[PDB]
Amino acid sequence: VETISFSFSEFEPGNDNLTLQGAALITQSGVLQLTKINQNGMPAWDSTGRTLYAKPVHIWDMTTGTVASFETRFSFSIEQPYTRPLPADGLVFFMGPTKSKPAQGYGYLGIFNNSKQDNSYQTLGVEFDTFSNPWDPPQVPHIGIDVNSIRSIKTQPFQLDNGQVANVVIKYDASSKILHAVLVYPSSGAIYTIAEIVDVKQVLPEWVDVGLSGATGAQRDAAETHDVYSWSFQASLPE
Amino acid sequence: VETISFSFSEFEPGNDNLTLQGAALITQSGVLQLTKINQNGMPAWDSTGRTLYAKPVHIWDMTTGTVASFETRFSFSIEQPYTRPLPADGLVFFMGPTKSKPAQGYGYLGIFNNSKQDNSYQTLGVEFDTFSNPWDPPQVPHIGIDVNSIRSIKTQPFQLDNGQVANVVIKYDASSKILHAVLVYPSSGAIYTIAEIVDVKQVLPEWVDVGLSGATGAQRDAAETHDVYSWSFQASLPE
Ligand SMILES: OC[C@H]1O[C@@H](O[C@H]2[C@H](O)[C@@H](O)[C@@H](O)O[C@@H]2CO)[C@H](O)[C@@H](O)[C@H]1O
Ligand SMILES: OC[C@H]1O[C@@H](O[C@H]2[C@H](O)[C@@H](O)[C@@H](O)O[C@@H]2CO)[C@H](O)[C@@H](O)[C@H]1O
Ligand SMILES: [Ca+2]
Ligand SMILES: [Ca+2]
Ligand SMILES: [Mn+2]
Numbered sequence A, B: 001v002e003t004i005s006f007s008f009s010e011f012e013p014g015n016d017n018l019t020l021q022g023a024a025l026i027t028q029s030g031v032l033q034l035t036k037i038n039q040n041g042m043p044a045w046d047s048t049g050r051t052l053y054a055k056p057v058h059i060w061d062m063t064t065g066t067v068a069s070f071e072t073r074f075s076f077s078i079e080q081p082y083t084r085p086l087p088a089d090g091l092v093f094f095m096g097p098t099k100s101k102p103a104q105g106y107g108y109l110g111i112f113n114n115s116k117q118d119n120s121y122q123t124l125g126v127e128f129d130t131f132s133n134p135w136d137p138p139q140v141p142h143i144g145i146d147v148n149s150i151r152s153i154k155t156q157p158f159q160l161d162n163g164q165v166a167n168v169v170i171k172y173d174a175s176s177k178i179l180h181a182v183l184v185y186p187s188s189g190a191i192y193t194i195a196e197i198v199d200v201k202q203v204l205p206e207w208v209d210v211g212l213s214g215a216t217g218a219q220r221d222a223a224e225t226h227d228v229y230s231w232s233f234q235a236s237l238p239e
Protein backbone atom coordinates (compact mmCIF):
# COMPACT_ATOMS: atom_id res chain seq x y z
CA VAL A 1 0.00 0.00 0.00
CA GLU A 2 1.38 3.39 -1.06
CA THR A 3 0.74 6.13 1.51
CA ILE A 4 1.49 9.84 1.75
CA SER A 5 0.71 11.82 4.88
CA PHE A 6 1.49 15.21 6.39
CA SER A 7 0.19 17.35 9.23
CA PHE A 8 0.62 20.97 10.33
CA SER A 9 -0.54 21.92 13.82
CA GLU A 10 0.58 25.39 12.78
CA PHE A 11 2.89 26.97 10.23
CA GLU A 12 6.44 28.26 10.55
CA PRO A 13 8.45 30.38 8.06
CA GLY A 14 10.88 28.48 5.88
CA ASN A 15 9.37 25.00 6.28
CA ASP A 16 10.67 23.37 3.10
CA ASN A 17 7.68 20.99 2.98
CA LEU A 18 5.52 23.83 1.64
CA THR A 19 5.64 25.71 -1.67
CA LEU A 20 4.31 29.27 -1.46
CA GLN A 21 3.12 31.12 -4.55
CA GLY A 22 1.97 34.66 -5.17
CA ALA A 23 0.90 36.51 -2.02
CA ALA A 24 0.92 33.40 0.23
CA LEU A 25 2.82 34.26 3.40
CA ILE A 26 3.45 32.71 6.82
CA THR A 27 3.36 35.19 9.71
CA GLN A 28 5.67 34.86 12.69
CA SER A 29 2.59 34.05 14.76
CA GLY A 30 2.21 30.77 12.84
CA VAL A 31 -0.73 31.57 10.55
CA LEU A 32 -0.72 31.11 6.75
CA GLN A 33 -2.10 34.19 4.96
CA LEU A 34 -3.12 33.19 1.43
CA THR A 35 -3.93 36.74 0.35
CA LYS A 36 -2.16 40.01 1.17
CA ILE A 37 -2.90 41.98 4.32
CA ASN A 38 -1.70 45.61 4.33
CA GLN A 39 0.39 46.86 7.25
CA ASN A 40 -2.67 48.64 8.63
CA GLY A 41 -4.25 45.22 9.09
CA MET A 42 -6.81 45.50 6.28
CA PRO A 43 -7.01 42.84 3.52
CA ALA A 44 -5.76 43.98 0.12
CA TRP A 45 -7.77 43.66 -3.09
CA ASP A 46 -6.34 42.30 -6.35
CA SER A 47 -4.47 39.56 -4.48
CA THR A 48 -3.87 35.86 -5.19
CA GLY A 49 -1.87 33.32 -3.21
CA ARG A 50 -1.47 29.55 -3.09
CA THR A 51 0.31 26.92 -1.01
CA LEU A 52 1.20 23.43 -2.18
CA TYR A 53 2.79 20.38 -0.61
CA ALA A 54 6.37 20.13 -1.91
CA LYS A 55 5.81 16.49 -2.89
CA PRO A 56 3.27 15.21 -5.45
CA VAL A 57 0.94 12.45 -4.34
CA HIS A 58 0.10 9.30 -6.27
CA ILE A 59 -3.70 9.42 -6.49
CA TRP A 60 -4.34 6.50 -8.89
CA ASP A 61 -2.43 4.04 -11.10
CA MET A 62 -3.03 2.92 -14.71
CA THR A 63 -1.34 -0.49 -14.64
CA THR A 64 -3.08 -1.72 -11.48
CA GLY A 65 -6.24 0.28 -12.21
CA THR A 66 -6.66 1.26 -8.56
CA VAL A 67 -7.41 4.69 -7.12
CA ALA A 68 -6.50 6.11 -3.71
CA SER A 69 -8.79 7.25 -0.91
CA PHE A 70 -7.85 10.48 0.81
CA GLU A 71 -8.79 12.86 3.59
CA THR A 72 -7.77 16.43 4.36
CA ARG A 73 -8.58 18.72 7.27
CA PHE A 74 -7.83 22.38 7.79
CA SER A 75 -8.96 25.43 9.72
CA PHE A 76 -9.40 28.90 8.32
CA SER A 77 -11.05 32.23 8.92
CA ILE A 78 -12.41 34.78 6.47
CA GLU A 79 -12.90 38.32 7.73
CA GLN A 80 -14.93 40.80 5.69
CA PRO A 81 -14.06 44.21 7.23
CA TYR A 82 -15.48 46.51 4.56
CA THR A 83 -19.11 47.60 4.26
CA ARG A 84 -19.01 48.36 0.54
CA PRO A 85 -18.31 47.07 -1.97
CA LEU A 86 -19.17 43.37 -1.67
CA PRO A 87 -16.27 41.15 -0.45
CA ALA A 88 -14.49 38.63 -2.73
CA ASP A 89 -13.45 36.11 -3.83
CA GLY A 90 -12.92 33.03 -1.66
CA LEU A 91 -10.54 30.11 -1.14
CA VAL A 92 -10.15 26.55 -2.44
CA PHE A 93 -8.62 23.21 -1.69
CA PHE A 94 -7.48 21.62 -4.95
CA MET A 95 -5.74 18.72 -6.62
CA GLY A 96 -4.30 19.17 -10.09
CA PRO A 97 -1.32 18.63 -12.42
CA THR A 98 2.12 18.70 -10.80
CA LYS A 99 4.47 21.69 -11.06
CA SER A 100 1.49 24.03 -11.43
CA LYS A 101 1.70 27.80 -11.16
CA PRO A 102 -1.07 30.23 -10.16
CA ALA A 103 -3.76 30.72 -12.82
CA GLN A 104 -6.32 33.55 -13.02
CA GLY A 105 -7.35 35.30 -9.81
CA TYR A 106 -10.67 36.82 -8.74
CA GLY A 107 -13.61 34.46 -9.32
CA TYR A 108 -11.24 31.86 -10.77
CA LEU A 109 -9.61 31.58 -7.35
CA GLY A 110 -6.13 31.07 -8.76
CA ILE A 111 -6.79 27.61 -10.22
CA PHE A 112 -8.73 28.19 -13.47
CA ASN A 113 -8.14 30.50 -16.46
CA ASN A 114 -11.79 31.08 -17.35
CA SER A 115 -15.31 29.72 -16.84
CA LYS A 116 -15.14 26.95 -19.45
CA GLN A 117 -15.81 23.30 -18.76
CA ASP A 118 -12.51 21.87 -20.01
CA ASN A 119 -11.25 18.37 -19.15
CA SER A 120 -7.66 19.44 -19.82
CA TYR A 121 -7.67 21.30 -16.50
CA GLN A 122 -7.56 17.91 -14.75
CA THR A 123 -8.40 19.81 -11.58
CA LEU A 124 -10.62 18.95 -8.63
CA GLY A 125 -11.50 21.48 -5.97
CA VAL A 126 -13.76 22.19 -3.03
CA GLU A 127 -14.38 25.93 -2.97
CA PHE A 128 -15.62 28.32 -0.28
CA ASP A 129 -16.85 31.03 -2.63
CA THR A 130 -17.69 34.43 -1.18
CA PHE A 131 -18.67 36.27 -4.38
CA SER A 132 -21.49 35.53 -6.79
CA ASN A 133 -20.17 35.60 -10.36
CA PRO A 134 -22.49 35.06 -13.35
CA TRP A 135 -21.74 31.32 -13.20
CA ASP A 136 -22.49 31.09 -9.48
CA PRO A 137 -25.77 30.40 -7.68
CA PRO A 138 -27.21 33.62 -6.14
CA GLN A 139 -26.31 32.59 -2.57
CA VAL A 140 -22.92 33.42 -1.04
CA PRO A 141 -20.89 32.27 0.61
CA HIS A 142 -21.32 28.73 -0.63
CA ILE A 143 -19.38 25.49 -0.64
CA GLY A 144 -18.94 24.03 -4.10
CA ILE A 145 -17.41 20.93 -5.62
CA ASP A 146 -15.43 21.88 -8.73
CA VAL A 147 -14.63 19.33 -11.43
CA ASN A 148 -12.67 20.70 -14.40
CA SER A 149 -14.53 24.00 -14.15
CA ILE A 150 -15.24 26.92 -11.86
CA ARG A 151 -18.93 26.17 -12.47
CA SER A 152 -19.53 23.78 -9.57
CA ILE A 153 -21.40 20.52 -10.15
CA LYS A 154 -22.80 20.80 -6.62
CA THR A 155 -23.37 23.78 -4.36
CA GLN A 156 -24.28 24.32 -0.70
CA PRO A 157 -24.97 27.75 0.85
CA PHE A 158 -23.59 28.47 4.29
CA GLN A 159 -23.63 31.43 6.64
CA LEU A 160 -20.32 33.14 7.27
CA ASP A 161 -19.33 33.73 10.88
CA ASN A 162 -17.29 36.88 10.20
CA GLY A 163 -13.73 36.52 11.44
CA GLN A 164 -14.36 33.17 13.19
CA VAL A 165 -12.38 29.98 12.65
CA ALA A 166 -14.07 27.21 10.68
CA ASN A 167 -13.04 23.55 10.67
CA VAL A 168 -13.18 21.66 7.41
CA VAL A 169 -13.07 17.94 6.71
CA ILE A 170 -12.97 16.69 3.12
CA LYS A 171 -13.02 12.93 2.53
CA TYR A 172 -12.99 10.79 -0.61
CA ASP A 173 -13.90 7.07 -0.71
CA ALA A 174 -12.52 5.39 -3.82
CA SER A 175 -14.97 2.51 -3.31
CA SER A 176 -18.18 4.46 -3.86
CA LYS A 177 -16.46 7.42 -5.53
CA ILE A 178 -18.05 9.72 -2.97
CA LEU A 179 -16.51 13.04 -2.06
CA HIS A 180 -18.01 14.29 1.20
CA ALA A 181 -17.06 17.63 2.72
CA VAL A 182 -18.15 19.15 6.00
CA LEU A 183 -17.72 22.65 7.42
CA VAL A 184 -18.10 23.44 11.10
CA TYR A 185 -18.14 26.71 13.02
CA PRO A 186 -17.17 25.90 16.64
CA SER A 187 -18.19 29.41 17.68
CA SER A 188 -21.85 29.04 16.67
CA GLY A 189 -22.08 25.27 16.41
CA ALA A 190 -23.16 25.55 12.77
CA ILE A 191 -22.57 22.42 10.65
CA TYR A 192 -22.75 22.26 6.87
CA THR A 193 -22.37 19.16 4.75
CA ILE A 194 -22.14 18.47 1.03
CA ALA A 195 -21.52 15.33 -0.99
CA GLU A 196 -21.30 14.35 -4.64
CA ILE A 197 -20.02 11.49 -6.78
CA VAL A 198 -16.65 12.10 -8.41
CA ASP A 199 -14.65 9.64 -10.48
CA VAL A 200 -11.09 10.76 -9.73
CA LYS A 201 -9.74 8.33 -12.33
CA GLN A 202 -11.46 10.27 -15.12
CA VAL A 203 -10.52 13.70 -13.76
CA LEU A 204 -7.01 13.81 -12.30
CA PRO A 205 -3.68 12.55 -13.65
CA GLU A 206 -1.92 9.72 -11.75
CA TRP A 207 0.23 12.18 -9.81
CA VAL A 208 -1.05 15.55 -8.59
CA ASP A 209 -0.13 18.54 -6.48
CA VAL A 210 -2.45 19.24 -3.54
CA GLY A 211 -2.85 22.75 -2.21
CA LEU A 212 -4.84 25.72 -1.01
CA SER A 213 -5.58 28.88 -2.98
CA GLY A 214 -7.25 32.19 -2.18
CA ALA A 215 -8.03 35.44 -3.98
CA THR A 216 -9.45 38.92 -3.40
CA GLY A 217 -11.59 41.11 -5.67
CA ALA A 218 -10.98 42.89 -8.97
CA GLN A 219 -11.81 46.33 -7.63
CA ARG A 220 -10.76 48.49 -4.70
CA ASP A 221 -11.79 47.05 -1.34
CA ALA A 222 -13.55 44.01 -2.74
CA ALA A 223 -11.39 42.00 -0.36
CA GLU A 224 -11.38 39.84 2.74
CA THR A 225 -8.86 37.72 4.65
CA HIS A 226 -8.04 34.10 3.80
CA ASP A 227 -6.13 32.79 6.82
CA VAL A 228 -5.33 29.11 7.40
CA TYR A 229 -4.25 27.87 10.84
CA SER A 230 -3.66 24.16 10.29
CA TRP A 231 -3.74 21.56 7.55
CA SER A 232 -3.37 17.78 7.38
CA PHE A 233 -3.63 15.36 4.48
CA GLN A 234 -3.65 11.59 4.07
CA ALA A 235 -4.01 9.31 1.03
CA SER A 236 -3.80 5.53 0.61
CA LEU A 237 -3.24 3.84 -2.74
CA PRO A 238 -4.02 0.10 -2.33
CA GLU A 239 -1.01 -2.15 -3.08
CA VAL B 1 -44.04 18.83 -3.65
CA GLU B 2 -45.39 17.47 -0.37
CA THR B 3 -43.18 18.34 2.59
CA ILE B 4 -43.08 17.13 6.18
CA SER B 5 -41.11 18.96 8.85
CA PHE B 6 -40.76 19.06 12.63
CA SER B 7 -38.35 20.49 15.18
CA PHE B 8 -37.77 20.01 18.93
CA SER B 9 -35.45 22.48 20.68
CA GLU B 10 -36.21 20.40 23.75
CA PHE B 11 -38.71 17.72 24.71
CA GLU B 12 -41.86 18.22 26.76
CA PRO B 13 -43.82 15.44 28.56
CA GLY B 14 -47.19 14.57 27.07
CA ASN B 15 -46.51 16.14 23.67
CA ASP B 16 -48.75 13.99 21.47
CA ASN B 17 -46.52 14.64 18.44
CA LEU B 18 -44.17 11.94 19.74
CA THR B 19 -44.82 8.24 20.28
CA LEU B 20 -42.82 6.71 23.13
CA GLN B 21 -42.20 2.95 23.23
CA GLY B 22 -40.51 0.64 25.70
CA ALA B 23 -38.45 2.34 28.40
CA ALA B 24 -38.36 5.68 26.52
CA LEU B 25 -39.23 8.58 28.81
CA ILE B 26 -39.21 12.39 28.75
CA THR B 27 -37.96 14.05 31.93
CA GLN B 28 -39.42 17.21 33.44
CA SER B 29 -36.13 18.96 32.67
CA GLY B 30 -36.87 18.37 28.99
CA VAL B 31 -34.45 15.60 28.06
CA LEU B 32 -35.46 12.41 26.24
CA GLN B 33 -34.07 9.29 27.95
CA LEU B 34 -34.30 6.45 25.44
CA THR B 35 -33.18 3.87 27.98
CA LYS B 36 -33.94 3.66 31.69
CA ILE B 37 -32.02 5.46 34.41
CA ASN B 38 -32.48 4.46 38.04
CA GLN B 39 -33.48 6.92 40.76
CA ASN B 40 -29.80 6.97 41.76
CA GLY B 41 -28.77 8.45 38.41
CA MET B 42 -27.22 5.25 37.03
CA PRO B 43 -28.20 3.64 33.69
CA ALA B 44 -30.05 0.32 33.88
CA TRP B 45 -29.02 -2.75 31.88
CA ASP B 46 -31.48 -4.84 29.87
CA SER B 47 -33.36 -1.72 28.71
CA THR B 48 -34.88 -0.77 25.34
CA GLY B 49 -36.69 2.40 24.35
CA ARG B 50 -37.78 4.12 21.15
CA THR B 51 -39.39 7.39 20.06
CA LEU B 52 -41.31 7.65 16.80
CA TYR B 53 -42.64 10.79 15.18
CA ALA B 54 -46.42 10.49 15.58
CA LYS B 55 -46.99 10.86 11.81
CA PRO B 56 -45.66 8.76 8.91
CA VAL B 57 -43.68 10.49 6.18
CA HIS B 58 -43.90 9.93 2.43
CA ILE B 59 -40.40 8.90 1.31
CA TRP B 60 -41.19 7.96 -2.28
CA ASP B 61 -44.06 7.36 -4.69
CA MET B 62 -44.66 4.48 -7.13
CA THR B 63 -46.92 6.47 -9.45
CA THR B 64 -44.34 9.15 -10.26
CA GLY B 65 -41.25 7.18 -9.27
CA THR B 66 -40.02 10.21 -7.36
CA VAL B 67 -38.13 9.77 -4.10
CA ALA B 68 -37.79 12.41 -1.37
CA SER B 69 -34.64 14.04 -0.02
CA PHE B 70 -34.42 14.40 3.73
CA GLU B 71 -32.31 15.75 6.56
CA THR B 72 -32.35 15.14 10.30
CA ARG B 73 -30.34 16.65 13.14
CA PHE B 74 -30.22 15.74 16.82
CA SER B 75 -28.03 16.01 19.90
CA PHE B 76 -27.31 13.23 22.34
CA SER B 77 -24.93 12.08 25.03
CA ILE B 78 -23.82 8.62 26.04
CA GLU B 79 -22.32 8.22 29.50
CA GLN B 80 -20.50 5.00 30.35
CA PRO B 81 -20.20 4.99 34.15
CA TYR B 82 -18.82 1.49 34.75
CA THR B 83 -15.27 0.24 34.20
CA ARG B 84 -16.45 -3.35 33.71
CA PRO B 85 -18.26 -5.09 32.22
CA LEU B 86 -18.08 -3.45 28.79
CA PRO B 87 -20.86 -0.90 28.16
CA ALA B 88 -23.64 -1.60 25.61
CA ASP B 89 -25.37 -1.32 23.30
CA GLY B 90 -25.92 1.99 21.47
CA LEU B 91 -28.57 4.14 19.76
CA VAL B 92 -29.99 4.48 16.22
CA PHE B 93 -31.87 6.89 14.01
CA PHE B 94 -34.13 4.80 11.81
CA MET B 95 -36.87 4.71 9.22
CA GLY B 96 -39.05 1.67 8.77
CA PRO B 97 -42.55 0.25 8.24
CA THR B 98 -45.35 2.18 9.95
CA LYS B 99 -47.23 1.01 13.06
CA SER B 100 -44.13 -0.86 14.21
CA LYS B 101 -43.27 -2.01 17.74
CA PRO B 102 -39.79 -2.38 19.21
CA ALA B 103 -37.95 -5.46 17.94
CA GLN B 104 -35.10 -7.27 19.73
CA GLY B 105 -33.00 -5.34 22.23
CA TYR B 106 -29.27 -5.47 23.00
CA GLY B 107 -27.09 -5.47 19.88
CA TYR B 108 -30.21 -5.40 17.71
CA LEU B 109 -30.81 -1.88 19.04
CA GLY B 110 -34.56 -2.48 19.06
CA ILE B 111 -35.05 -2.31 15.30
CA PHE B 112 -34.07 -5.80 14.10
CA ASN B 113 -35.00 -9.33 15.18
CA ASN B 114 -31.65 -10.89 14.21
CA SER B 115 -28.48 -10.20 12.20
CA LYS B 116 -29.84 -11.50 8.90
CA GLN B 117 -29.74 -9.23 5.86
CA ASP B 118 -33.34 -9.46 4.67
CA ASN B 119 -35.20 -7.10 2.34
CA SER B 120 -38.43 -7.75 4.22
CA TYR B 121 -37.03 -5.76 7.16
CA GLN B 122 -37.53 -2.58 5.10
CA THR B 123 -35.38 -0.69 7.58
CA LEU B 124 -32.71 1.97 7.16
CA GLY B 125 -30.69 3.14 10.12
CA VAL B 126 -27.64 5.15 11.08
CA GLU B 127 -26.31 3.62 14.26
CA PHE B 128 -23.95 4.73 17.01
CA ASP B 129 -22.87 1.29 18.18
CA THR B 130 -20.98 1.03 21.47
CA PHE B 131 -20.61 -2.75 21.76
CA SER B 132 -18.90 -5.12 19.35
CA ASN B 133 -21.12 -8.09 18.49
CA PRO B 134 -20.12 -11.00 16.20
CA TRP B 135 -21.30 -9.02 13.16
CA ASP B 136 -19.49 -5.82 14.19
CA PRO B 137 -15.99 -4.62 13.35
CA PRO B 138 -13.56 -4.74 16.32
CA GLN B 139 -13.71 -0.99 17.00
CA VAL B 140 -16.33 0.70 19.17
CA PRO B 141 -18.01 2.97 19.32
CA HIS B 142 -18.61 3.27 15.60
CA ILE B 143 -21.05 4.95 13.25
CA GLY B 144 -22.66 2.50 10.86
CA ILE B 145 -25.11 2.67 7.98
CA ASP B 146 -27.67 -0.11 8.32
CA VAL B 147 -29.61 -1.24 5.25
CA ASN B 148 -32.09 -4.01 6.09
CA SER B 149 -29.58 -5.44 8.54
CA ILE B 150 -27.73 -4.83 11.78
CA ARG B 151 -24.62 -5.86 9.86
CA SER B 152 -23.68 -2.39 8.53
CA ILE B 153 -22.66 -1.94 4.89
CA LYS B 154 -20.32 0.85 5.96
CA THR B 155 -18.61 1.56 9.26
CA GLN B 156 -16.66 4.47 10.79
CA PRO B 157 -14.92 4.29 14.19
CA PHE B 158 -15.13 7.32 16.45
CA GLN B 159 -13.86 8.20 19.90
CA LEU B 160 -16.48 8.67 22.60
CA ASP B 161 -16.26 11.84 24.66
CA ASN B 162 -17.79 10.09 27.70
CA GLY B 163 -20.83 11.93 29.04
CA GLN B 164 -20.51 14.85 26.61
CA VAL B 165 -22.99 16.15 24.02
CA ALA B 166 -22.58 15.23 20.35
CA ASN B 167 -24.27 16.89 17.38
CA VAL B 168 -25.43 14.75 14.50
CA VAL B 169 -26.43 15.69 10.98
CA ILE B 170 -27.74 13.03 8.60
CA LYS B 171 -28.60 14.03 5.04
CA TYR B 172 -29.91 12.11 2.04
CA ASP B 173 -29.77 13.36 -1.54
CA ALA B 174 -32.25 11.55 -3.80
CA SER B 175 -30.44 12.90 -6.87
CA SER B 176 -27.13 11.14 -6.14
CA LYS B 177 -28.65 8.60 -3.74
CA ILE B 178 -25.97 9.61 -1.24
CA LEU B 179 -26.54 9.27 2.48
CA HIS B 180 -24.00 11.40 4.35
CA ALA B 181 -23.85 11.54 8.13
CA VAL B 182 -21.61 13.64 10.33
CA LEU B 183 -20.92 13.54 14.08
CA VAL B 184 -19.40 16.45 15.97
CA TYR B 185 -18.23 16.82 19.56
CA PRO B 186 -18.29 20.55 20.42
CA SER B 187 -16.36 19.85 23.63
CA SER B 188 -13.31 18.34 21.90
CA GLY B 189 -13.93 19.66 18.40
CA ALA B 190 -13.79 16.13 16.98
CA ILE B 191 -15.50 15.68 13.62
CA TYR B 192 -16.41 12.35 12.07
CA THR B 193 -17.95 11.81 8.68
CA ILE B 194 -19.35 8.82 6.81
CA ALA B 195 -21.10 8.41 3.48
CA GLU B 196 -22.50 5.61 1.37
CA ILE B 197 -24.84 5.07 -1.57
CA VAL B 198 -28.34 3.96 -0.63
CA ASP B 199 -31.26 3.47 -2.99
CA VAL B 200 -34.22 4.30 -0.76
CA LYS B 201 -36.89 3.00 -3.17
CA GLN B 202 -35.41 -0.52 -3.16
CA VAL B 203 -35.17 -0.53 0.63
CA LEU B 204 -37.99 1.40 2.29
CA PRO B 205 -41.76 1.33 1.70
CA GLU B 206 -43.66 4.35 0.31
CA TRP B 207 -44.61 5.50 3.81
CA VAL B 208 -42.40 5.08 6.88
CA ASP B 209 -42.11 5.90 10.56
CA VAL B 210 -38.98 7.85 11.54
CA GLY B 211 -37.56 7.50 15.03
CA LEU B 212 -34.78 7.01 17.53
CA SER B 213 -34.01 3.81 19.42
CA GLY B 214 -31.55 2.86 22.15
CA ALA B 215 -30.69 -0.20 24.22
CA THR B 216 -28.52 -1.35 27.12
CA GLY B 217 -26.81 -4.73 27.56
CA ALA B 218 -27.88 -8.27 28.40
CA GLN B 219 -25.94 -8.61 31.65
CA ARG B 220 -25.66 -6.60 34.88
CA ASP B 221 -24.06 -3.16 34.46
CA ALA B 222 -23.43 -3.61 30.73
CA ALA B 223 -25.13 -0.26 30.43
CA GLU B 224 -24.74 3.36 29.45
CA THR B 225 -26.88 6.42 28.97
CA HIS B 226 -28.78 7.28 25.76
CA ASP B 227 -30.05 10.85 26.21
CA VAL B 228 -31.33 13.04 23.37
CA TYR B 229 -31.67 16.81 23.82
CA SER B 230 -33.09 17.96 20.50
CA TRP B 231 -34.26 16.56 17.17
CA SER B 232 -35.42 18.03 13.87
CA PHE B 233 -36.42 16.41 10.60
CA GLN B 234 -37.47 17.48 7.12
CA ALA B 235 -38.20 15.73 3.86
CA SER B 236 -39.25 16.97 0.42
CA LEU B 237 -41.08 14.82 -2.10
CA PRO B 238 -41.09 16.48 -5.54
CA GLU B 239 -44.72 16.93 -6.69
O1 LIG C 1 -16.12 43.44 -7.22
C1 LIG C 1 -15.54 42.17 -6.97
C2 LIG C 1 -15.73 41.26 -8.17
O2 LIG C 1 -15.18 41.95 -9.31
C3 LIG C 1 -15.42 41.25 -10.55
O3 LIG C 1 -14.87 42.00 -11.58
C4 LIG C 1 -15.60 43.18 -11.97
C5 LIG C 1 -14.85 44.44 -11.51
O4 LIG C 1 -14.86 44.51 -10.09
C6 LIG C 1 -15.50 45.70 -12.09
O5 LIG C 1 -14.71 46.84 -11.78
C7 LIG C 1 -15.63 45.57 -13.60
O6 LIG C 1 -14.38 45.41 -14.15
O7 LIG C 1 -16.40 44.42 -13.93
C8 LIG C 1 -15.78 43.18 -13.49
C9 LIG C 1 -16.69 42.06 -13.94
O8 LIG C 1 -16.16 41.41 -15.08
C10 LIG C 1 -14.75 39.86 -10.49
O9 LIG C 1 -15.04 39.14 -11.69
C11 LIG C 1 -15.27 39.08 -9.27
O10 LIG C 1 -14.59 37.84 -9.16
C12 LIG C 1 -15.06 39.90 -8.00
O11 LIG C 1 -13.67 40.10 -7.78
O1 LIG D 1 -22.48 -7.83 27.89
C1 LIG D 1 -23.17 -6.99 26.98
C2 LIG D 1 -23.47 -7.72 25.69
O2 LIG D 1 -24.19 -8.93 26.04
C3 LIG D 1 -24.42 -9.79 24.91
O3 LIG D 1 -25.08 -10.92 25.36
C4 LIG D 1 -24.27 -11.89 26.06
C5 LIG D 1 -24.61 -11.87 27.56
O4 LIG D 1 -24.21 -10.63 28.12
C6 LIG D 1 -23.90 -13.02 28.29
O5 LIG D 1 -24.32 -13.06 29.64
C7 LIG D 1 -24.23 -14.35 27.60
O6 LIG D 1 -25.60 -14.55 27.62
O7 LIG D 1 -23.81 -14.30 26.23
C8 LIG D 1 -24.49 -13.29 25.46
C9 LIG D 1 -23.94 -13.37 24.05
O8 LIG D 1 -24.84 -14.06 23.19
C10 LIG D 1 -25.28 -9.06 23.87
O9 LIG D 1 -25.43 -9.88 22.72
C11 LIG D 1 -24.62 -7.72 23.47
O10 LIG D 1 -25.49 -6.99 22.63
C12 LIG D 1 -24.30 -6.89 24.72
O11 LIG D 1 -25.52 -6.49 25.34
CA1 LIG E 1 -17.49 33.26 -7.21
CA1 LIG F 1 -23.08 -3.83 18.33
MN1 LIG G 1 -18.92 29.35 -6.79
Ligand SMILES: [Mn+2]
Residues within 6 Å of the ligand: B127, B129, B136, B137, B142, B144, B150, B152
Ligand atom coordinates in the same frame (compact mmCIF):
# COMPACT_ATOMS: atom_id res chain seq x y z
MN1 LIG H 1 -22.45 -2.06 14.58
